[PDB]
Design a protein around this ligand. Structure first.
Ligand code: LLL
Ligand code: LLL
Ligand code: MG
Ligand code: MG
Ligand code: MG
Ligand code: MG
Ligand code: MG
Ligand code: MG
Ligand code: MG
Ligand code: MG
Ligand code: MG
Lengths: 129, 88, 218
RNA sequence: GUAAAGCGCACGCAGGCGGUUUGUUAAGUCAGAUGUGAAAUCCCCGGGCUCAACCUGGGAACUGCAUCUGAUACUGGCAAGCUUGAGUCUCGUAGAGGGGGGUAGAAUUCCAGGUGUAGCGGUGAAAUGCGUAGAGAUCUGGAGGAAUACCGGUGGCGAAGGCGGCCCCCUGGACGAAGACUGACGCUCAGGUGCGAAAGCGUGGGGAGCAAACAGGAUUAGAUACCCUGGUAGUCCACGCCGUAAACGAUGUCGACUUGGAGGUUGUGCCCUUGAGGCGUGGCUUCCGGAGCUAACGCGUUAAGUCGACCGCCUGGGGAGUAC
């Protein structure tokens, strides 16, 4: 069963990028949104909109540069049954910098680069390059 | 399965109100019925392993319910056991 | 839309999830081509032909299928273009070096038939070498005069002529083909969603592209 | 999946993992600081012996633990919900699903009598064998046990093993339809419990056909076989034991994503239903196959593709799944 909602969101994105799917939907949630946000603010998805009133959705549109998708590689990290918490000086550098590491800090869900400078650490989430 | 007459009947005696076959208490009771009633059948034949497999499921589920009831309301749980004389 | 309203979709329901994007809508046991999105491809594609066609653009028209065949000989020849409507030889594009040798053989053979150059040996040898030209011209003829790979390539259907396209893109040769439902667009770099056949559709674009090509020649 | 490796299959305690919202808490988590983490090593910068090895000043490091002060996204606790997960109720549908008891017809064999006469049976030929004490064939009647032709399928049910005449009784699951109901009660599961083809074992029944053993007859160089004539266990039944199999999809279970084509089975909705017809919307199931995966063969929305939760197992061949 859905023991890990995040993984689904992540997997759904890449599965689409390959199927050239315009966008993708799914049941939204606080975290799901936050993550999707950083994905847009960082340049991996055109935009996104959570539909549904009582039952929230998430119109997440996949972005594509040229003859290929923007998301070349995206995987989970701090998955359940095996969490991962790094220090303000442990934050990993995805794709030597050309990538991003979504980390949940005590100040919100930001990126490794951002969080690092801010001087705060947190729990990684994925390595969207 | 169980007889509609006996079904609705028991559904009311434990139903939190009028027509609510969803209530936990109801289920437990509804199950216990088919349970104590089926034993008679199982007392005979015995080798009806296939039908036995089902019986056990009702048991396990009943347990998973009674346990839940207690984990979310030690009150109803304790009282529920009474009218059903279960869990020793 | 004018002549456009004379071919629409085709191919019952075998289709291909790749053409789906260019497909209009299904009906009477068969989907139709979304001409509405085909119009842009109609011009845009040809707009790229006149360009390189400006300098004796080596435009190779491909169409082995029965219908197109008897047509390509005209339209594809009624301008500085090349036509191929008889069993696309294996490698006549990529294996030119070896294939051209065949063309030369065909050349001299013509000179023989030309004047008193074929009058040799009894009717035996005559017929022996005469029939040789026939077949040789059927395949090489429509390209005999081209001592160099084509600048472009316009094939009718991207299916029956699959071999042709495969070589082109392999050598880096822009291909323009009419892909419809049961066609594979991944190959051709210039999509032309239109009836793979249709006596009208075939001639329509054939002459249509011809002009846009002859015009580019200043 | 085929190289070593998915427990034969289920239920399930501990354990691991847990949909969604608000609040709350601040334990994990992150930040700061303070202790402490011996000196020496190591490392960086710099000194001293002619250099080097070596010696030395300072710092870094000692990624560890504890306390104090914060931060609150995420995980955890608590409070309150919610409904898509899971489950309940109502009405049906298809089914070789299971346990029990009946009962029908086809055939085999055997017994009894009629008719009838020199063969029958068998093989590649034969022979053993059965026949004038009358077989075989044919007919009539009776006894008995085992299994259900056709329907029957590229079909259905089941967790697995497996499950076929028909009728009844007891009983499990699955699926659909509208709604109504509980409110995460879930997923997996070491150990554990139960189910387990055939063969085998115990007691007691049964015993037609088939048939290890065994006995003849052939074959052959031999023939402790294949073939033939016989035939005991057993095969059948009841209750108990035994737990293995190429227990095989050689592919663990739950959930979510990912182009298509063709065929079967089963529920429901809607249609000029005028009809087979056609148009939807669920379950299960075959064949082909794209991307991708793979060492290849091939798998391919029922994955061996893309991912997550949990468990099981592999670590060269022989010795050995043997010894103890
Ligand atoms: C008469 N046809 C039946 C059909 O009605 C249906 O019936 C079976 C029935 O035959 C079974 O009974 C069978 O098995 C019993 C032991 N388990 C002993 C009696 C025997 N007939 C029942 N246990 C289950 C029904 N669904 O499935 C099997 C069948 C043979 O096709
Ligand atoms: C894609 N192949 C399909 C195969 O999957 C199957 O499809 C059935 C289809 O026949 C049924 O259709 C049935 O119900 C229709 C009204 N709803 C009328 C036709 C009837 N056969 C559908 N209800 C369910 C599909 N899975 O049978 C037909 C087919 C062409 O071979
Ligand atoms: Mg092997
Ligand atoms: Mg193996
Ligand atoms: Mg298995
Ligand atoms: Mg020290
Ligand atoms: Mg919390
Ligand atoms: Mg099944
Ligand atoms: Mg047995
Ligand atoms: Mg016995
Ligand atoms: Mg396949």
């Amino acid at each position: 069963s859905m023991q890990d909602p995040i993984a689904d969101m992540l997997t759904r994105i890449r599965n689409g990028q390959a199927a050239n799917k315009a966008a993708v939907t799914m049941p939204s949630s606080k975290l799901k949104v936050a993550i999707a946000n950083v994905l847009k603010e960082e340049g991996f998805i055109e935009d996104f909109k959570v539909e549904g009133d009582t039952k929230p959705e998430l119109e997440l549109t996949l972005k594509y540069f040229q003859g290929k998708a923007v998301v070349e590689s995206i995987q989970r990290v701090s998955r359940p049954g095996l969490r991962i918490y790094k220090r303000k000086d442990e934050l990993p550098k995805v794709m030597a910098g050309l990538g991003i590491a979504v980390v949940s800090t005590s100040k919100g869900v930001m990126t490794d680069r951002a969080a690092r400078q801010a001087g705060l650490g947190g729990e990684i989430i994925c390595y969207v390059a | 399965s169980l007889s509609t007459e006996a079904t609705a009947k028991i559904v009311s005696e434990f139903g939190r109100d009028a027509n609510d076959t969803g209530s936990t208490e109801v289920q437990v009771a509804l199950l216990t019925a088919q349970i104590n009633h089926l034993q008679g059948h199982f007392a005979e034949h015995k080798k009806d392993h296939h039908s036995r497999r089902g019986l056990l499921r009702m048991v396990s589920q009943r347990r998973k319910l009674l346990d839940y009831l207690k984990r979310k309301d030690v009150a109803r749980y304790t009282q529920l056991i009474e009218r059903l004389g279960l869990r020793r | 839309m004018l002549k456009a309203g004379v071919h629409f979709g085709h191919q019952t329901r075998y289709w291909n999830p790749k053409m789906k994007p260019f497909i209009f809508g299904a009906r009477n046991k068969v989907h139709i081509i979304n001409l509405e999105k085909t119009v842009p491809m109609f011009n845009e594609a040809l707009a790229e032909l006149n360009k390189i066609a400006s300098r004796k653009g080596k435009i190779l028209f491909v169409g082995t299928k029965r219908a197109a065949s008897e047509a390509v000989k005209d339209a594809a020849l009624s301008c500085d273009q090349f036509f191929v409507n008889h069993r696309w030889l294996g490698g006549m594009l990529t294996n030119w070096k070896t294939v051209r040798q065949s063309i030369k053989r065909l050349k001299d053979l013509e000179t023989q038939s030309q004047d008193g150059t074929f009058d040799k040996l009894t009717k035996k040898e005559a017929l022996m070498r005469t029939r040789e030209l026939e077949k040789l011209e059927n395949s090489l003829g429509g390209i005999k005069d081209m001592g160099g790979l084509p600048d472009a390539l316009f094939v009718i259907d991207a299916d029956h002529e699959h071999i042709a396209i495969k070589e082109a893109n392999n050598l880096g040769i822009p291909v323009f083909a009419i892909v419809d439902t049961n066609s594979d667009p991944d190959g051709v770099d210039f999509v032309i969603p239109g009836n793979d056949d249709a006596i009208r559709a075939v001639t329509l674009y054939l002459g249509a592209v011809a002009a846009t090509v002859r015009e580019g020649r200043s």
